[PDB]
Ligand binder design. Structure first.
Ligand code: HEM
Ligand SMILES: c1csc(-c2cnc3n2CCC3)c1
Length: 289
């Protein structure tokens, strides 16, 4: 099973920058969502969930086929709440109907990270919409109630190593949990991309509590929360080291996140030798828009 990247016919960097800009402008303008967090965090989560279905063993799942558009994947309980991100992107897709679904969903994530003052994430085009029968079954995204061994084993399926895992988890500095979506409540309503996840892990006083959905989570007096899988990064000696590294080096964290997130979004895709090199998009700020 091979998924070969195929550039949307006749499209070049300038076409994709226009799509980036349309998403970025909407992010700026629809700022009310989720008590003024806006749509950045949910779009990052969407890009991760459409990618996180990949299995390195058979090359099924991943971002290529844009299969979240199909009912089976759209209604996965693990994807509860991501419909808000789908609805955000819908008008954009109507404006630029030439772009594939996988390309749009993944570009949404890249745009969100950059517009939230994160690192630049190189991005490649050419994902191709695949038919409904290529939709992966539910159950491939991870559980939050587990420990460090689970997290490590889970991520081996996505060909991610310890450093890549800890860097990717830094995105949890963004946004919040919603009891109705996942059975967890709380967060920090943050919409700026920083290394604060790692700082909060090391510096807050965490207490284990049972929430109103009968799930255990770690809570701090500052009003923050960690999932059990978040907290596992300071329980495991190998993860802890890396957590300390990112807490003390913002630039390192940005560079490692950029690499891991691009890899996550590209897993399962074969890029021909003639393919364009990755694009790096300018932010609205860089364009004076
Ligand atoms: C062990 C792996 C992971 C687990 C178990 C996990 C679990 C969760 C849960 C339960 C939520 C709350 C969802 C809600 O109630 O709305 C959440 C939120 C979020 N996750 Fe993860 N996650 C993991 C990895 C990641 C990764 C790798 C990224 C991206 C690089 C990511 C990005 C996000 C973002 C941005 C939110 C906030 C969404 C919002 O504010 O609507 N997560 N995660
Ligand atoms: C902001 C302070 S803690 C925190 C957090 C920890 N784990 C998660 N979040 C938000 C999404 C999941 C976000």
């Amino acid at each position: 099973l091979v998924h070969v990247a195929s550039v949307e016919k006749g499209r070049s960097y300038e076409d994709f920058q226009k799509v980036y800009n349309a998403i970025a402008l909407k992010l700026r303008e629809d700022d009310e969502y989720d008590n003024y967090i806006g749509y950045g965090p949910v779009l990052v989560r969407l890009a991760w969930h459409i990618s996180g279905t990949w299995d390195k063993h058979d090359n099924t799942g991943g971002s290529y086929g844009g299969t979240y558009r199909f009912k089976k994947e759209f209604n996965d309980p693990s994807n509860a709440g991501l419909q808000n991100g789908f609805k955000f992107l819908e008008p954009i897709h109507k404006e630029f109907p030439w772009i594939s679904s996988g390309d749009l969903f993944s570009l949404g994530g890249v745009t969100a990270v950059q517009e939230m003052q994160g690192p630049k994430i190189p991005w490649r085009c050419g994902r191709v919409d695949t038919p409904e029968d290529t939709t992966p079954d539910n159950g491939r995204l991870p559980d939050a109630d587990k420990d460090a061994g689970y997290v490590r084993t889970f991520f081996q399926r996505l060909n991610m190593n310890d450093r890549e895992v800890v860097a990717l988890m830094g995105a949890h500095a963004l946004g919040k949990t919603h009891l109705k979506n996942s059975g967890y409540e709380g967060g920090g309503a943050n919409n700026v991309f920083t290394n604060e996840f790692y700082l909060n892990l090391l510096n807050e006083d965490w207490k284990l509590e049972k929430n109103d959905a009968n799930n255990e989570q770690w809570d701090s007096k500052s009003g923050y929360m960690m999932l059990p899988t978040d907290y596992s990064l300071i329980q495991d000696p190998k993860y802890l080291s890396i957590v300390k590294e990112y807490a003390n080096d913002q630039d390192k964290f940005f560079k490692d996140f950029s690499k891991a997130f691009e890899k996550l979004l590209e897993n399962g895709i074969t890029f021909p030798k003639d393919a364009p090199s990755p694009f790096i998009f300018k932010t609205l700020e860089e364009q004076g828009l």
